[PDB]
Design a protein around this ligand. Structure first.
Ligand SMILES: N[C@H](CCC[C@H](N)C(=O)O)C(=O)O
Ligand SMILES: N[C@H](CCC[C@H](N)C(=O)O)C(=O)O
Lengths: 320, 320
């Protein structure tokens, strides 16, 4: 049948969310997990990542769930040569480059590669584009949280001396309300979000770790940053959740008439929504290839019906 | 240059909104208005609709701004044979049929036809699809207003004896809040919207007109309907606006974790946002055809980047 044979590459939080979610897909079959490790805390079969070539015939889509600001750039293209790949690559400054290289790779193999999926990048990206396209004269703002930013949390974890750490992005409600009225055109994303950190570290390292957090380009400089050092027991019991979300707000004027477009996401578990998007886009990638296409593609180049497990005609008869 | 020669067919509220808005498009040129009437309250050149064939060489896209529940079904296909057409056909039960016929017509002429655009159908349709696709187990509700429904207002105007009339769709805020919590799964759209009518008519016709409103299939039966008869002076001074909007709310569970997706529109002028969408989709239709495609297409089959006046690479470098 047209049941999409799928495999996951890597096995952290995201890989784990994708695994449990692939089960609720009516047209997908998890064939296994490709890992560097021989044993893994799962019932799902595991193969050495180095034996992908041997499985390149039993797997339709390769969900790249390993990487962050490292393993995806270096490793992602190698996988494009064996199957259709879907990644959630979120380094915004590098997305254009990452897509150029993935493209050469995918087109060269005759398979499709969907890059930088998720909710941001991903769902928020699509929303920014549609609203800005439809409203000729517009103002647009993207707000995150309140909630745990995965990108900022692991940036904190890479700082020598940091044992455990979490980062909460907190948006200004005033800014939020002003953006809805079209009164936030003089404000940028750095002025409308406070970044709150909770870090476990030896007291001897506090001064150094704090300066390192505050002067970290891209992630923290330019932002109002709060740094909280707590003992490990407090970290462990009070910071267990992973909620997140945000708003993409666009306003536009059509001649003395204001229009407000707002997309909102309230997620109880951050990696679970990222995996859900990554999955629907893997269904699209196969459809795109199965219908003859190749190379890299951003979420901006996929027609919405390609993500739906449903027949196009049912969608037009029920959803339009 | 690649400045899209465009023309408008018809000239009511929508045609009028499209005209003023085409001016703020950086890549479009209004060539004229095709009308049944010789004279029109505009500076824009007007041609007899019957002379479209003579202009089929000077016009790239034909914005169909005439029709509603009549002129579009009968007339829309004739125009597909002369240029790319964009319509805002909103008869939900007939959209699938309307697209089948438009398709034969467009494919037969080698040009593209974008059907049923606007905000609903249109923007709300896209949102229903994405959220339902990404969230495997989901609940979805569409709320309208508060505001003036154009479809229901002109349905009222067709009732013999009705001189003037307006209809306001009012959604239940309780339902709204319950949908955000995932507690509205037992409710339908008929139970969550009250339909409020303001009608001018001779007092002799009130009883008959009211029964006709209440028993009108599709538009009013099944809904809680309020009918208000007012004098014309009151109608004229107090019911001049055309605001509208709504929410598409989807919830989903990923294993004990809830996710809420909400798309909201607050429009100060209803036809102005419909025209803004219709316009961006006319830019896409040309791109689709200019890149070799033909037949009818719903908003579900257009990749988002096709609506943006901007270069794809700028979008990926700035918006992803
Ligand atoms: N930059 C955003 C987060 C985006 C979402 C996802 N990419 C993540 O890292 O959680 C924030 O500051 O909270
Ligand atoms: N059925 C919706 C309206 C959709 C929007 C647009 N199609 C219009 O007629 O205004 C309502 O009841 O208010």
């Amino acid at each position: 049948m047209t049941n999409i044979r799928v495999a996951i590459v890597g096995y952290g939080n995201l890989g784990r969310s994708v695994e449990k979610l692939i089960a609720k897909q009516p047209d997908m079959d998890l064939v296994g997990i490709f890992s560097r490790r021989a044993t893994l805390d799962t019932k799902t079969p595991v193969f050495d990542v180095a034996d992908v070539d041997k499985h390149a015939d039993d797997v339709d889509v390769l969900f790249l769930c390993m990487g962050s600001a490292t393993d995806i750039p270096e490793q992602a293209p190698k996988f494009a040569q064996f199957a259709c790949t879907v990644d959630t690559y979120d380094n915004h400054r590098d997305i254009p480059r990452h897509r150029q290289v993935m493209n050469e790779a995918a087109t060269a193999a005759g398979n499709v590669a969907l890059v930088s999926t998720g909710w941001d990048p991903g769902m928020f990206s699509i929303n920014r584009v549609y609203a800005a396209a439809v409203l000729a004269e517009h103002q647009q703002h993207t707000f995150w949280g309140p909630g745990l930013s995965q990108g900022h949390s692991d940036a904190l974890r890479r700082i020598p001396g940091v044992q455990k750490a979490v980062q909460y992005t907190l948006p200004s409600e005033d800014a939020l309300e002003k953006a809805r009225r079209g009164e936030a055109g003089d404000l940028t994303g750095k002025q409308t979000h406070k970044r709150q950190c909770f870090v476990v570290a030896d007291a001897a390292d506090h001064e150094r770790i704090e300066n390192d957090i505050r002067t970290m380009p891209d992630y923290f400089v330019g932002y109002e940053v709060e740094v909280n050092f707590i003992d490990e027991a407090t970290f462990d019991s009070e910071h267990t959740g992973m909620p997140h979300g945000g708003h993409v707000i666009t306003t536009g004027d059509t001649g003395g008439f204001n229009h407000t477009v707002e997309y909102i996401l309230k997620l109880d578990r951050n990696p679970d929504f990222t995996a859900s998007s990554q999955i629907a886009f893997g269904r699209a990638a196969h459809r795109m290839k199965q219908q003859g296409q190749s190379g890299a593609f951003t979420v901006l180049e996929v027609a919405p019906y390609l993500l739906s497990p449903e027949n196009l005609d049912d969608l037009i008869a029920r959803d339009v």
